[PDB]
């Protein structure tokens, strides 16, 4: 990932989303598109981003359904052009495998979300996170998502998945996570609001990159 | 809910989804639309269903993001016409409250998904399900989703939420759940494939209703 920086484009209208992404295109080559934008503008927005920016697209859908439905969601998502999809690990191994099956068939990637970055994650997710990470390792998952907001937890996750695995981390900026500290364990950071809500997105992205040069 | 039967419309193309729903419209007044259909045809499909069938629409999105993103997803979904949205409880209380806030503002409903119906749910969700249910009760949640595939678990969930709460349950038919047994605890059953994949959807729906009379 270019500059170890992934833009979380959660604006909800195409003009703004495309405008802001364009303002920071020189600093990134990977964009995470989620439901706020997709539900507001349609799945065709993914193809629009790929054609306009020639960027990698990670669908931050955090799939969390039964196996059969997970397969359908992944199929629809990859057909739309997504290079990868983020899947929740809490629902179990069968639900994860369903996503892996479609990813293998279509030559795409799966990112396993272990622990989440928000406060509520401490209630149920945190206690299962280490086991969810191990589950991913046992199934050969190579891409993971961990919390920037809890460096020691992110560090433990890194220990479990190993140095070879790819780890990205949200929660940098708006949620309180620090770019540099997070990159001690993650290969790339996910940044949304700190950039897309900034007075000048380009300066914001440049500032982040400057602090981690 | 008419006939205590909610149709899970997970077909992935407009023509088929509308045709099948039309075939069983005389037996239902509530349809659950999820990502397989919405990602394939766009969120406008929700409005299409409401105007063509005058039915209640439950968005089976199982929202499972951080609070801020959950708010955006719920807002986009309710603006699209959804009467209710299904929210995952495992991400915690703040993520649930975010959904409740938007539902309150827009005069819509939130259904809290406690334990899931597939095998993988036993790995992490099951052990947290009773507490997730209690969390919902403590926050005043009145609508819940529990597994048809585990009658005793569904029964325990009913005990926790009380007779007052509304409980719907997926996993009937394709996943092995029995309509009658499930309705001993749930107010309504969610049925997808057993109906929409049937040679004769209308006959399939009638058959289910027959054994429930
Ligand atoms: O544990 C997680 C999983 C997903 N995200 C997502 O990552 C982005 C973080 O954006 P922001 O807080 O930098 O604005 C959003 O798209 C959000 O939905 C998190 O924040 N935390
Ligand atoms: O625990 C859960 C939560 C959601 N669903 C959803 O309920 C429907 C069940 O459909 P079917 O198995 O009758 O086809 C699908 O939309 C599915 O995604 C489950 O099956 N189990
Ligand atoms: Cl995400
Ligand atoms: Cl659902």
Curated annotation (Swiss-Prot), chains A, B:
The active site is at 62 (proton donor). Pathway: Pyrimidine metabolism; UMP biosynthesis via de novo pathway; UMP from orotate: step 2/2. GO terms for cellular component: cytosol. Keywords: Decarboxylase, Lyase, Pyrimidine biosynthesis. GO terms for molecular function: orotidine-5'-phosphate decarboxylase activity. Its EC number is 4.1.1.23. The keyword Lyase applies. It comes from the Archaea. It is an enzyme of class 4 (lyase). GO terms for biological process: 'de novo' pyrimidine nucleobase biosynthetic process; 'de novo' UMP biosynthetic process. InterPro entries: Aldolase_TIM (IPR013785), OMPdecase (IPR014732), OMPdecase_arc (IPR047595), OMPdecase_AS (IPR018089), OMPdeCOase_dom (IPR001754), RibuloseP-bd_barrel (IPR011060). Substrate binds at residues 10, 32, 60-69, 117, 170-180, 192-193. It catalyses: orotidine 5'-phosphate + H(+) = UMP + CO2. Catalyzes the decarboxylation of orotidine 5'-monophosphate (OMP) to uridine 5'-monophosphate (UMP). Homodimer. Belongs to the OMP decarboxylase family. Type 1 subfamily. NCBIfam families: PRK13813.1, pyrF. This is Orotidine 5'-phosphate decarboxylase. It comes from Methanothermobacter thermautotrophicus (strain ATCC 29096 / DSM 1053 / JCM 10044 / NBRC 100330 / Delta H). The lineage of its organism: Archaea, Methanobacteriati, Methanobacteriota, Methanomada group, Methanobacteria.
């Amino acid at each position: 990932v270019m500059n170890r920086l992934i833009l979380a484009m959660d604006l909800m209208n195409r003009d703004d989303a495309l405008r802001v992404t364009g303002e920071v295109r020189e600093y990134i080559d990977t964009v995470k598109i989620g439901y706020p934008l997709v539900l507001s503008e349609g799945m065709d927005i993914i193809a629009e981003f790929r054609k306009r920016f020639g960027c990698r697209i990670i669908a931050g859908f955090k799939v969390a359904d039964i196996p059969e439905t997970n397969e359908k969601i992944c199929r629809a998502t990859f057909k739309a052009g997504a290079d990868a999809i983020i899947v929740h690990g809490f629902p179990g191994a069968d639900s994860v495998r369903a996503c892996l099956n479609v990813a293998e068939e279509m030559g795409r990637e799966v990112f396993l979300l272990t622990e989440m970055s928000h406060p509520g994650a401490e209630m149920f997710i945190q206690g299962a996170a280490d086991e969810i990470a191990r589950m991913g390792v046992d199934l050969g998952v190579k891409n993971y998502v961990g919390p920037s907001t809890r460096p020691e937890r992110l560090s433990r996750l890194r220990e479990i998945i190993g140095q070879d695995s790819f780890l990205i981390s949200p929660g940098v900026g708006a949620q309180g996570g620090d770019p540099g500290e997070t990159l001690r364990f993650a290969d790339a950071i996910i940044v949304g609001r700190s950039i897309y809500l900034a007075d000048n997105p380009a300066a914001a992205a440049a500032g982040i990159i400057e602090s981690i040069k």
